Design a protein around this ligand. Structure first.
Ligand SMILES: CCS(=O)(=O)c1ccccc1C(=O)N1CCN(c2nc3ccc(F)cc3s2)C[C@@H]1C
Ligand SMILES: COCCOCCOCCOc1ccc(C(C)(C)CC(C)(C)C)cc1
Ligand SMILES: COCCOCCOCCOc1ccc(C(C)(C)CC(C)(C)C)cc1
Ligand SMILES: CC(C)(C)CC(C)(C)c1ccc(OCCOCCO)cc1
Ligand SMILES: CC(C)(C)CC(C)(C)c1ccc(O)cc1
Ligand SMILES: *[C@@H]1O[C@H](CO)[C@@H](O)[C@H](O)[C@H]1NC(C)=O
Ligand SMILES: *[C@@H]1O[C@H](CO)[C@@H](O)[C@H](O)[C@H]1NC(C)=O
Ligand SMILES: [K+]
Lengths: 95, 230
């Protein structure tokens, strides 16, 4: 039947437009899933420094790109550093 | 990854891809097809993982389809400067921005070819008219090469794995040859989303790291089909 099919309205603010989708998912499954891939690849010394520069890093990235991640993180209780790392996985050779 | 844009004997363009990455046990559960709406209407469709807002596979209905494959991503300090100092775009974010803003297959190739990026990538684009099929080998600053369909010359498909097409694939990881072999046997006459799907189901094109397979045709946007593998 293929994967789930979801609607995302680009007329809703970036922080809010992914949240109706996240309702259908176990919040703890997603958190643990992000935590596993990040912990398996990002060195612990990199994670420490990124968590301390996550707010400065967010401001230097495309606002709409980061605004959607910020909203999903608050909803999932995920750390911004974790949301940015997984969304910049391709741009980081660790992944 | 493996992306294929091809044209059949009647002038129809088909576009399919295989997304290869570890952690399939996790990501298969989080794979989703997303229809992005404007004014309540489908502006474009994409396949992604819950939590990842960029699109590596997507379709602008009746305009073009696009997929992105990994290219040598260089060093992290080059990407850092390009990202934070030069303000270049993430790869999957440009791909999704193009699906949103580009008004035609031609405009999409321009955007995907010349917009500065944080790292290298292969952009594969298909359209809704004959010959509308290219592979954009991207540098950070622009296109290293553009590779078009040429049916009258005998080039009715373009097969991109993760290596430059003007060079031979590595002996250790060659999914290009079996993909070509499977396409020649299919034939430009019998090309379709189903036969295309079977090309992408051939080993090792279909390997243990394949998470999902998508086949699409911007001219028939309702045929957009993603399937979870394994
Ligand atoms: C070129 C596309 S690719 O997926 O194969 C790839 C190859 C090498 C390095 C990075 C990436 C890449 O762009 N991604 C890989 C993993 N990813 C993930 N998204 C989530 C989302 C939730 C979660 F719990 C874990 C993950 S891992 C983001 C992106 C698709
Ligand atoms: C900065 O606002 C963007 C403009 O929005 C116009 C439409 O109204 C949407 C604003 O609503 C919110 C409310 C809260 C939030 C945050 C990120 C603070 C928390 C959240 C998303 C978990 C509710 C974001 C957007
Ligand atoms: C396997 O080889 C990779 C080695 O990984 C360890 C080296 O990492 C050191 C620096 O790590 C980072 C991580 C993120 C970043 C940001 C998010 C600021 C930018 C990015 C994603 C473009 C690299 C910069 C440096
Ligand atoms: C963020 C920077 C790049 C500005 C500063 C830091 C100190 C992190 C830096 C500075 C320089 C640097 O060079 C890498 C070695 O190049 C040799 C070619 O192989 C790497 C990192
Ligand atoms: C290069 C280094 C890993 C040492 C620092 C990094 C990217 C985590 C950083 C730190 C602060 C900041 O504002 C942006 C990036
Ligand atoms: C969310 O994370 C915060 C840490 O910032 C923690 O204090 C809180 O207990 C968490 N809540 C849930 C429901 O996980
Ligand atoms: C998405 O939106 C369209 C138009 O509003 C609607 O017809 C369709 O049923 C919606 N699909 C989902 C899964 O919400
Ligand atoms: K829930």
């Amino acid at each position: 039947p293929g994967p789930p099919l979801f609607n995302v309205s680009l007329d809703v603010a970036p922080e809010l437009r992914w949240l109706p989708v996240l309702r259908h998912y176990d919040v703890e499954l997603v958190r643990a899933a992000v935590a596993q891939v990040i912990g398996d690849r990002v060195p612990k010394w990199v994670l420490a420094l990124i968590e301390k520069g996550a707010l400065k890093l967010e401001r230097l990235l495309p606002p709409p790109f980061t605004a959607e991640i910020r909203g999903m993180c608050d909803f999932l209780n995920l750390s911004l550093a974790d949301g940015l790392l997984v969304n910049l996985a391709y741009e980081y050779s660790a992944f | 990854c493996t992306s294929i844009v091809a044209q059949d004997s009647r002038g129809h363009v088909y576009h399919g891809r295989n997304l290869d990455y570890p952690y399939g046990s996790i990501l298969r559960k989080l794979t989703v097809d997303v229809q992005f709406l404007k004014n309540g209407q489908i502006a474009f469709t994409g396949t992604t993982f819950i939590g990842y807002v960029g699109l590596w596979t997507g379709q602008s209905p009746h305009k073009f389809t696009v997929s992105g494959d990994e290219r040598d991503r260089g060093w992290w300090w080059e990407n850092l400067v390009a990202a934070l100092f030069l303000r270049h775009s993430p790869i999957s974010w440009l791909l999704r921005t193009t699906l949103s803003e580009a008004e035609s297959f031609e405009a999409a190739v321009y955007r995907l070819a010349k917009t500065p990026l944080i790292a290298d990538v292969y952009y594969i684009v298909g359209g809704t008219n004959p010959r509308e099929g290219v592979v954009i080998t991207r540098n950070r600053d622009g296109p290293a090469d553009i590779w078009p369909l040429d049916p009258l010359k005998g080039v009715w498909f373009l097969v991109e794995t993760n290596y430059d097409h003007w060079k031979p694939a590595p002996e250790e990881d060659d999914r290009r040859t079996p993909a070509i072999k499977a396409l020649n046997a299919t034939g430009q006459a019998k090309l379709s989303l189903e036969t295309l799907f079977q090309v992408l189901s051939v080993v090792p094109v279909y390997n243990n790291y394949t998470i999902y397979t998508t086949v699409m045709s911007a001219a028939s946007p309702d045929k957009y089909m993603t399937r979870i593998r394994n």
